[PDB]
Amino acid sequence: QPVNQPILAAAQSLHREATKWSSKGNDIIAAAKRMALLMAEMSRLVRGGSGTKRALIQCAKDIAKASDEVTRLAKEVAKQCTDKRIRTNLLQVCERIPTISTQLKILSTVKATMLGRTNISDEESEQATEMLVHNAQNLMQSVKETVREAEAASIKIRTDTLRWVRKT
Ligand X SMILES: CCCCCCCC(=O)OC[C@H](COP(=O)(O)O[C@@H]1[C@H](O)[C@H](O)[C@@H](OP(=O)(O)O)[C@H](OP(=O)(O)O)[C@H]1O)OC(=O)CCCCCCC
Q: Where do contacts with ligand X occur on this chain (CB under 6 A)? A: 20, 151-152, 155, 164, 166
- Tell me the C-alpha distance between 64 and 104, whole Å: 8
Q: Which residues pair with 108 in a beta bridge?
A: none
**Radius of gyration for the alpha carbons in the chain, expressed in angstroms and rounded:** 17
Nearer to ligand X, 106 or 165 (CB): 165
- Tell me the C-alpha distance between 28 and 72, whole Å: 9
Considering CB distances under 5 to 8 angstroms, the limit depending on partner class, which of a copy of itself, ligand X, none binds residue 123?
a copy of itself
Residue 105 beta carbon to ligand X: minimum distance, rounded to whole angstroms? 30
Residue 21 beta carbon to ligand X: minimum distance, rounded to whole angstroms? 8
Considering CB distances under 5 to 8 angstroms, the limit depending on partner class, which of ligand X, a copy of itself, none binds residue 151?
ligand X
Nearer to ligand X, 20 or 79 (CB): 20
Residue 168 identity:
T
Nearer to ligand X, 18 or 60 (CB): 18
- Sign of the C-alpha dihedral, residues 123, 124, 129, 134? positive
The residue among 165, 155, 131, 147 whose CA lies nearest residue 15 is 147
Nearer to a copy of itself, 82 or 127 (CB): 127
Nearer to a copy of itself, 20 or 54 (CB): 54
Residue 123 beta carbon to a copy of itself: minimum distance, rounded to whole angstroms? 5
- Tell me the C-alpha distance between 64 and 5, whole Å: 21
SS3 assignment for 69-126: HHHHHHHHHHCCCCCHHHHHHHHHHHCCHHHHHHHHHHHHHHHHHHCCCCCCCHHHHH
Considering CB distances under 5 to 8 angstroms, the limit depending on partner class, which of ligand X, a copy of itself, none binds residue 155?
ligand X
Residue 137 beta carbon to ligand X: minimum distance, rounded to whole angstroms? 20
Considering CB distances under 5 to 8 angstroms, the limit depending on partner class, which of ligand X, a copy of itself, none binds residue 164?
ligand X
